[PDB]
Amino acid sequence: GSLYSDERDKPLLSPTAQKKFEEYQNKLANLSKIIRENEGNEVSPWQEWENGLRQIYKEMIYDAFDALGVEMPKDMEVHFAGSSDLDAFVIVKNDEDIKKVKPVFDALNNLCQRIFTASINPSRLIGTPDDLFGMLKDGMVADVEATAMSILTSKPVLPRYELGEELRDKIKQEPS
Length: 176
Hints:
Strand order of the largest sheet: 3-2-1-4
Shape: globular
CATH class: Mainly Alpha
Number of helices: 6
């Protein structure tokens, strides 16, 4: 059972996958614990929880690129839509990048499913700003206006914004 296998296919992790699994579980448990315990001295505990989850997921993303031996493209972005919703969405610069990046997020999706069971949003969409705008323009998505809105109000997981702004500016330009 490797770290990024489907739970239903490989229910037990190998010894090494298990240690890494437990390391993520423990960051999650600790994050949850500290937020709840300090709730009386925290202004916005749910925002703190979200912000911590974005950091853990960012870490998990770097870890998955490394474990799969894939170089993360430098212009690639990951944004969180929502609070289902559109969830994490991956914006690449070129459509060529999708082939190499998509299997890494699929791998992460599997690991996130496992973590859910043992107790973060899945990544659902991946594309260029053009691609994703087009899926909204052409009605390929359940609940277009609310998907659109969630993109407008998404928060960045990686410290990259340029493509995200192209997508938002494209959305903003279309009236409904």
